[PDB]
Amino acid sequence: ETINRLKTNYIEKMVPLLKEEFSYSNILEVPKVVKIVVNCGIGDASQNAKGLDAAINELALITGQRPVKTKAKTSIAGFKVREGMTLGIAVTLRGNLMYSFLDRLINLALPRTRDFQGVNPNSFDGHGNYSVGFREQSVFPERGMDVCITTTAKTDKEAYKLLSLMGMPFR
RNA sequence: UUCUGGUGUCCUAGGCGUAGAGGAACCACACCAAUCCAUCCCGAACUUGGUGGUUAAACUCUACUGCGGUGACGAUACUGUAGGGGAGGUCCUGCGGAAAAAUAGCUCGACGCCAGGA
Ligand SMILES: [Mg+2]
Ligand SMILES: [Mg+2]
């Protein structure tokens, strides 16, 4: 019912709770979410403009922020592309948007996925960061995407402990 | 004369890593706000204006020779010069010069200026 749940629930309840878990000598050693990078790659984006200009608006309503036409780092003929042409669709979420986006993730989009049985807890990279893959975006109440969550954690255990508190149903 | 910060020159370039110290002041980060300004998206960075929590990260100081960097003397190779062998490939001698490599060893910088503090 409150305005910002995660921002208030984190600073008040989680930081005293997560500090007691690992017994950090300082409060600043606690991890926290830095950003959420939402990628959406389309190889055939160079062909059409309607499918490009439309999908850019689809993600914007999901995030409340414009995507960015991500360009190629180098040309290659195996996938018939050229340098400087747009291939990916990306955006950066920081501050309150990443929390508001996470509220729309665990409670709106992630439950509505067909045949849902929890997300893989082995998706951590080994340095506290976490990633998610989608096939559809209509689960958001308004094609796939690679949501990349960043965190200041060194190991994955405190991250798994961190993410699990803010929902994130793991099998 | 020392401590902190700022700013340099010299230099064998003085770093990585490990183990400690620092918060009064100083430096830094963290927290909040956003139309002077900014984002091929995002107040992260950049810019204003605020709260002072923390030395966690950075940075500063103290130590070492584990990596790294540095590095001989001596000897030998090579070589100038005057000569001499061998069918040739190439080799030897006298006078003079003289390494690289490796090892020992050295190395966790040296010296200034301004402000503040003692
Ligand atoms: Mg010698
Ligand atoms: Mg040598």
CA of A26 to C1' of B65 (A): 34
Nearest to A93 by CA among A159, A22, A38: A38
Which tokens is A65 given? 């922020």
d(CA A149, ligand 1 centre) in Å: 64
CA of A15 to C1' of B67 (A): 40
Contact A112, A137 (CB under 8 A): no
d(CA A15, ligand 1 centre) in Å: 69
Contact A32, A153 (CB under 8 A): no
* CA A15 – CA A93 distance, rounded (Å): 22
Resolution of the PDB structure in angstroms: 3.0
Experimental method: cryo-EM
Task: Give the 3-state secondary structure of residue A111.
Answer: coil
Nearest to A61 by CA among A146, A134, A142: A142
The nucleotide lying nearest A86 (C-alpha to C1') is: B40
CA of A101 to C1' of B44 (A): 18
